[PDB]
Amino acid sequence: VPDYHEDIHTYLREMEVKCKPKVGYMKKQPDITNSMRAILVDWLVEVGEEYKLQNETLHLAVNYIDRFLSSMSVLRGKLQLVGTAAMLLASKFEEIYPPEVAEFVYITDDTYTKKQVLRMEHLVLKVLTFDLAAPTVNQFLTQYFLHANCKVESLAMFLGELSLIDPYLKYLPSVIAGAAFHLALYTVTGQSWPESLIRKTGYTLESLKPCLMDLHQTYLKAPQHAQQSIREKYKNSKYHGVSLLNPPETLNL
Amino acid sequence: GTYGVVYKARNKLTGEVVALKKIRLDTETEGVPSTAIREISLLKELNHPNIVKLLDVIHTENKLYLVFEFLHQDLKKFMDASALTGIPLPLIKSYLFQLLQGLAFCHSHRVLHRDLKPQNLLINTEGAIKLADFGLARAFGVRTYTHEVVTLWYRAPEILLGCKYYSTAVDIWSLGCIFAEMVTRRALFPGDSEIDQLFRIFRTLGTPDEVVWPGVTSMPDYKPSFPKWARQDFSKVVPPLDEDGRSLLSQMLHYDPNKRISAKAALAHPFFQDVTKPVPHLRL
Amino acid sequence: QIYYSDKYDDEEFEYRHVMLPKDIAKLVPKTHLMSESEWRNLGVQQSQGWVHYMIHEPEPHILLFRRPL
Amino acid sequence: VSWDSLPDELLLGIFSCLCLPELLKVSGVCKRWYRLASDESLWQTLDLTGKNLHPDVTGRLLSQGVIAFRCPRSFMDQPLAEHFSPFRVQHMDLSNSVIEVSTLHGILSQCSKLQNLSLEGLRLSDPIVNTLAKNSNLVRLNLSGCSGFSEFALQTLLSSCSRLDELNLSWCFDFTEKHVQVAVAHVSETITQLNLSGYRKNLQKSDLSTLVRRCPNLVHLDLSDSVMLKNDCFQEFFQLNYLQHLSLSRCYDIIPETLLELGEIPTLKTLQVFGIVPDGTLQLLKEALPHLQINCSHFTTIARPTINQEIWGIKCRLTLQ
Amino acid sequence: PSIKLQSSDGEIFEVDVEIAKQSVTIKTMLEDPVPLPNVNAAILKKVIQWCTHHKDDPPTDDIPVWDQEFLKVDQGTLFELILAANYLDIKGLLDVTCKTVANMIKGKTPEEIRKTFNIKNDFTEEEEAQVRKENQWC
Amino acid sequence: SACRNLFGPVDHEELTRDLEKHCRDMEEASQRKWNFDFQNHKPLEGKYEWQEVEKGSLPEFYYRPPRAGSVEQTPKK
C-alpha cells in the first residue's frame, strides 16, 4: 500500500544529506590510506559473510566506519578493532539474533581483549552522537525495484557493493543507487530507466551520467582487482553466481 | 518496598516538566542492550507534541541517564479512577485524535511502535496525550523481523497465526482494542493463553474463513477443527457507542490487513472529523 | 498445578482447554492424539464424553477437549 | 547434445533422487517427461501429514500406485465425484482426519489389499463396514473412538476378517452389551494384542471368560475403566499363557493387594494399574512383587501407526517436509 | 596381472586387472586387447582415473568432493560419461553422476530446464494450463 | 578462513588513555547545563529544583525495569 511509500522516500532523500561524510577526510589522517580502507572493508565483508549476516548490516557498518574515520585520528593497529565495533553496532541495530561480543573478540585472533572493544564502543557511541539510523543505498534499491526479476536485483546489489568497495563518496547514496540500478538493468536486459522513477526521485539519466561512467569503468576493472571476496561470495547460486558475468564495454546512452 | 529513587527539575520553563531515567549497565555482557540503542536512536529522531520528547543522553561509564520530558498520569490508573462513571465521549474523541496523529507520524518516519498499551500512553492535565516505550521500535524498510510482539491481550491475528510478514497494520489493531476498552471499561479479549485469545476473538467476531479472510486456510496454524462461531451483533459488542463509531470500529478491527484502514485514512472519518479538545476530569 | 478453563460452546459441541505444568507437559505425544484412558493416566480429572480433538503447535502444553450435547 | 535421447531406465534412475515439489514441477516439460513423472516406482511411499487436499487429487494419487499412504489429521471435506480402479494401497493411516462419510465410503470401496489400517477418531457406518468386510488380509486394525455402526455390521466384519493380528476396538461411545457380546463371540482366533477399554457398564465376567476361553494367544491386554471385573477375572487371565503386558487401570472392583497374585502369572512383564493404587502403596506392591514393571509407560501401542515420521517402520519418500 | 583396453579408435590403455575389476561387465568377462566400440578414449581415460582413485574403496547424500571436482565440466561430456558408466555398469560412478545431474536440475523453472537441456517442447499453449491445474495442491 | 590478522598487536594502554581523554568532554557541560553530578548520581546547588518524588505518584513508565468408587465424572474446582 502506497499510504507511506512516497513520504518515506522524501524523508530518506532529506536525511541522506545531513549525515553525508566528508570526502577529503582520508588525507588528513596521518597513517591510513585508501588502499587501507579497501583492505579493511575487504576483511569486513569476509567476516560478515562468515557469520551469515545481512547486507544492510554491512552497509550501515561501513557507513559508521566512514563517518567515524572522517572525524578521528587513529593508528593502523586499531582499524580492525574499530571495524569490529562498527559491525557489532550494525548487527545490534538491524540484525535479529546478533552475534555476541565473544564471536567478534574471537574472530580477531584475540589481538584485542573484550574490555578494549567495550571502551571502543563507548567512544564510537559518543562521537556518533547516537544517530545510527542513517539511510543507505540498499533501501533505495529495494524501493526502486517495486516498479522485477531476481537476477536484475542481484546484479544491482552487486554493483552497489562494488561501488562501496572504493569517486563514489562524492555522489549521494541515492545517486549511486540510481546509477547501479540503471547499469544493471542495461547489462541484464538492455532496458532503460523508466519515466516513473524520474517522476518519483526527480533524478534523470543526465544528472547521473558521471557516476554512471565511473561505475561502468569500475565494473570493467573489477574482475582483475587484487581482491575478489565479494566476487567469490557472489559466485554462489544464492546470488545466482552472477559475479562472473562480462562487464559491458560501452553503454548506449 | 517499591525500591527506586527519581529526581525532578522545575525552575523556569513552559515545558518545565522533566524527569531522569537511569538504566543499569552490565559492562562485560553484551554491552549496551539492543533495546537501549534502538530506543535512543529512533527517539532522538522524532519531534512532535503527541510524543514524549528526549532532551539529552547521559552516558556514564556504567550508567545511562536520559532527560525525558515529565508528564502527570498514564491511562490505566486514569480509567481505574473513573471506572464507575465512565469517560466523556468528546474526551475519547480528542484522545483518539492525538493517538492517530502520533501513529501517522511514526509510520511516516519508517518506525514501528509494536508496544502500544494503556500503560504506555501518558496524558497531560490539559488533554494532550503522548506515546512512549520505543524500546521495541525498529526501523523497517517489508522483511521478516522479530516474531514476539506487543502483548497477548492486544496482539493481532496476524501474529497469533504465525504469519511471516507483519507490516505496519498491527498498531492499528492494538489501537482498536485500546479504544474499545476505553469506551466500555472492559478489555475486549482478556486471553489466558494464545489459543484462548484466538477463541475469544473468534467468538466475538465469528470464525474466519476464505470469504472473510483471503488466504487464511493457508496460514501455518489454521485447523478447521476450530469452533464454528458466527459474527455476533456489533452493537452489543460495544453498547454505549453510536452508529458512526460502530462503523469506524468495523473497519478498524477487520481481519485482512490489506482491508484494514490505515492512519491517514482514519483521520478523515466523519465520527472523527468532528473533533473537540476537552481537559481531563480527575487529578493527574 | 493442573489448570482448568471454563466451558465455552457453540450450538453443537461444548469445549474446554487445560493447561499443564512442565513435568506432565514434557510427556504429551507429538504424533498421535489421545484417548480418555490416556489422559486420565496423565492425570486429568473430568467426566465421560470429553474427547481430545487437536493439538496447537506453538504451545504443546495446552490440551483441547470437546464433547457433544 | 540431445538429452531427449536418454533411455527410460536412466531417466527413472535420475528422477528417483528428487523431492515431491520438483517432481511435480518437471512433469510439465514435454509429454514424455509427463509420462515418466508417474511410473509406479516413484510413487511407492507418499506423505501428506496435515495437508488439506481434495478427493479427486487423492484418488488420482492413490490410483497412481501408492503403497503406504500416510495422511493423518488432514481435512477432506469435499465430495468425491470421480470413479477409479481397485487401489493397490497396503498400509493406510487416516487417524483423526476430518473426512465425510460419503467420501470415506467411496474411497474405501476401492482398496482391497489393505495389510494395515487405521481409523482412529473417525465416524463410520453400516455401508462403510460392509465394504470393509472384503479386506480378508487385515493384519492389524484400529477403530478407537469410532461410532455409529451396528451389531450385524460388527459381527460380519469380524467373521470375514480372519487373520486379524491386533485389535483396538476401544472407547467407542455408542456401544451396547449386545455389541461387546457379539464382538467377543465372533473375534478371530489369532488375536495377539487386544484392547477393549471404556465399556464400563458393558464388560461382564461372562464375556471376558468367553474371550479367554476362545483366544489363547493374548500377549498385550487392557480393560481400563471397567467397573465389573473381579478377582475371578483374575484367575481367567491365569489361563492366559502369553500375557506379558496387562493393564487394568482404574478397574475399581479389584482390591489392590490381589494385584500381588498377578505377579504369580509367569510370563508377565508390566502391569499398569493407574487409578486404584493409593500412592505410597505402590512401593508396597513393588516389594510384594519386584519381578515386574508397574506404571512405567502411560501410552498404548495396540495398532498405533506412529509412536518418528515412519509409519509402521516404513519410510515415506515423497513428502512435503 | 593387467589388461589392455582398446577404445573406439585404438588407444590401448593398459590397466591393472584389480582396477578393471570395478567394471562388472569386464569382471564377469575375465571370469571366462579388447575393443569397447561404445566408448571414445577421451571419456575412457577419465573412467580409468575415477576407478583408480576409487580402486581400494570399501564397497544430498554427500557427493565426495573428489568426484565433485572431477564432475566440474559441461553438458556434453557429462552426458557421454553417464552413458559410458551405464554401458560398463559401474555402480558408484553412475550413482554419483545421477546425483549430480539431479542436483543441477534442482530448483530451476521448466523454461530454464527446457533451455539448458535443449528439449523440444510439445503439446503446449492449451495443456500446460491443465497440467498446472494438476499441481495446485503443491 | 575468516580468522586472520590484519596488522598484528599494537599497544593498548595508550588506547585506554586516548579513549578516556576523548570521553573527558562530558564532564564540564554536564554540570554546566544540567547542574547534576550524573557520575555520582547526586544533585547540585540548584537552578534545576531536584526533589525525590515517590514511586506511588508518577506513572510506572518512568521507573519500569527493562526486559469401587472413583466415579468417572467432573469434580469442579
Side-chain angles (χ1 to χ4, degrees), chain D residues 67-84:
Chain D
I67 282 174
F69 182 61
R70 158 171 198 251
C71 186
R73 284 130 50 211
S74 69
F75 292 162
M76 282 215 78
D77 53 357
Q78 286 150 5
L80 161 73
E82 314 172 7
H83 319 75
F84 296 94

Side-chain angles (χ1 to χ4, degrees), chain B residues 2-146 149-284:
Chain B
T2 315
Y3 161 77
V5 63
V6 296
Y7 292 163
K8 310 296 152 276
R10 269 64 165 165
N11 56 2
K12 274 80 67 178
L13 173 58
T14 70
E16 191 177 1
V17 285
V18 301
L20 182 137
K21 179 162 182 176
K22 186 175 87 95
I23 65 172
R24 267 72 185 180
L25 320 180
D26 54 86
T27 298
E28 276 281 343
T29 299
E30 174 67 21
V32 182
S34 70
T35 76
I37 289 312
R38 273 177 164 162
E39 189 148 63
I40 288 184
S41 296
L42 278 299
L43 183 63
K44 76 182 316 177
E45 201 181 330
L46 315 188
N47 314 308
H48 201 271
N50 292 324
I51 296 183
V52 56
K53 294 170 44 68
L54 193 144
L55 301 196
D56 191 290
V57 167
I58 296 309
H59 173 48
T60 76
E61 72 287 6
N62 282 33
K63 290 162 301 177
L64 267 187
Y65 296 93
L66 287 72
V67 189
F68 272 30
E69 165 191 358
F70 182 82
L71 200 45
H72 293 89
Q73 169 94 331
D74 70 79
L75 273 296
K76 198 44 193 306
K77 293 202 307 194
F78 167 87
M79 293 183 286
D80 271 1
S82 160
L84 81 173
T85 72
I87 302 309
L89 276 300
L91 189 47
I92 295 298
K93 300 170 68 62
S94 304
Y95 278 153
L96 194 64
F97 181 49
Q98 321 171 32
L99 294 174
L100 290 151
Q101 281 160 300
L103 267 191
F105 196 88
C106 295
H107 296 163
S108 66
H109 292 60
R110 87 194 161 91
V111 191
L112 282 173
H113 200 303
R114 295 190 309 180
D115 194 67
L116 289 203
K117 61 176 182 186
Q119 293 75 336
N120 294 330
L121 276 54
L122 318 183
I123 53 179
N124 76 336
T125 71
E126 298 75 15
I129 181 177
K130 316 165 179 181
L131 319 185
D133 194 323
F134 279 99
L136 284 190
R138 81 156 313 148
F140 78 108
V142 287
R143 217 175 82 210
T144 176
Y145 306 110
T146 308
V149 296
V150 61
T151 174
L152 202 162
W153 275 27
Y154 306 119
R155 289 180 187 172
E158 290 85 328
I159 300 94
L160 298 169
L161 301 199
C163 201
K164 200 166 71 177
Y165 298 138
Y166 61 80
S167 179
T168 176
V170 295
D171 281 356
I172 295 310
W173 168 276
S174 294
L175 190 64
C177 289
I178 300 188
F179 156 77
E181 65 182 1
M182 271 315 167
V183 167
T184 196
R185 287 152 295 178
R186 186 161 316 294
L188 273 190
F189 315 118
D192 294 330
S193 162
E194 309 194 358
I195 196 74
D196 177 39
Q197 183 55 340
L198 279 172
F199 280 46
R200 281 192 209 277
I201 297 161
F202 285 11
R203 189 170 65 241
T204 298
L205 289 204
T207 302
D209 64 67
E210 290 279 352
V211 164
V212 165
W213 193 341
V216 59
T217 75
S218 298
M219 307 281 326
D221 291 348
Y222 181 71
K223 294 132 159 181
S225 70
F226 282 164
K228 316 301 216 170
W229 280 318
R231 179 172 181 175
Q232 72 200 13
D233 190 334
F234 208 75
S235 46
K236 300 290 99 176
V237 161
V238 56
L241 185 140
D242 68 51
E243 186 276 343
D244 217 346
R246 249 198 306 285
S247 49
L248 181 137
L249 205 60
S250 306
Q251 53 282 359
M252 192 195 168
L253 291 203
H254 202 32
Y255 287 112
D256 185 309
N258 309 290
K259 310 309 158 311
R260 174 185 309 172
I261 67 182
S262 177
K264 44 195 63 156
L267 264 290
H269 192 269
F271 171 99
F272 192 45
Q273 64 65 30
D274 191 9
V275 168
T276 62
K277 208 280 200 175
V279 289
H281 39 79
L282 57 87
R283 59 94 178 173
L284 299 199

Side-chain angles (χ1 to χ4, degrees), chain F residues 2-75:
Chain F
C3 296
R4 299 195 292 100
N5 183 281
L6 288 153
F7 285 101
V10 188
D11 188 305
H12 301 103
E13 302 78 35
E14 49 87 18
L15 281 177
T16 67
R17 198 235 63 79
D18 167 80
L19 69 93
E20 59 86 16
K21 184 40 67 194
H22 291 171
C23 201
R24 295 300 82 67
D25 46 34
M26 177 211 182
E27 296 85 350
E28 308 79 358
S30 51
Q31 312 303 325
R32 298 285 75 78
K33 64 182 181 293
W34 288 126
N35 58 49
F36 193 99
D37 194 317
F38 297 87
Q39 319 88 306
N40 297 320
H41 193 67
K42 293 314 294 161
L44 294 176
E45 85 298 334
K47 178 48 183 151
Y48 283 159
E49 286 70 359
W50 303 106
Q51 310 90 352
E52 292 75 19
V53 174
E54 189 51 35
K55 312 300 166 286
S57 173
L58 58 85
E60 49 85 15
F61 152 70
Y62 287 80
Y63 56 82
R64 168 177 324 163
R67 63 180 65 86
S70 159
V71 286
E72 323 182 20
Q73 278 290 1
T74 334

